[PDB]
Design a protein around this nucleic acid. Structure first.
Length: 107
DNA sequence: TACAATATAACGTCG
DNA sequence: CGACGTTATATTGT
């Protein structure tokens, strides 16, 4: 929890210095942004790499919770994640550990 | 004003 | 042929 929040406050400074602050990223599919949660959800559903190979965000919506009437709630989150932690998991996957391999065709 | 997010509808794929 | 999943479009809110 605390280190994801610390590294997303560091991203918040860097992304505000890139004309793309969290001040223009108001919500998460159902609830508030809560980055650390959609991150650990994506890391259970196979990182952003299994997500891109399978459109597994519908399953991230499963780890997030239920929201009546949605069929692409977490799908919108994909477009947030690709600017809100896809540029920062680069330190996790380049200078700590790579638990997400490039092998992912489909099923 | 314009931009971003969420919801709904349609299309495609799989069973 | 039917059901499920994914993608695209539209509407609403900030």
């Amino acid at each position: 929890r605390a280190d994801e929040q610390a590294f997303l406050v560091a991203l918040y400074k860097y992304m505000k210095e890139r004309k793309t602050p969290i001040e223009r990223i108001p919500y998460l599919g159902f609830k508030q942004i809560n980055l650390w949660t959609m991150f650990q959800a994506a890391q259970k559903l196979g990182g952003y790499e299994t997500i891109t190979a399978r459109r597994q965000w519908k399953h991230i919506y499963d780890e997030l919770g239920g929201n009546p009437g949605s069929t692409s709630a977490a799908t919108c989150t994909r477009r947030h994640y690709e600017r809100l932690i896809l540029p920062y998991e680069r330190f996790i996957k380049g200078e700590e550990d790579k638990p997400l391999p490039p092998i992912k065709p489909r099923k």
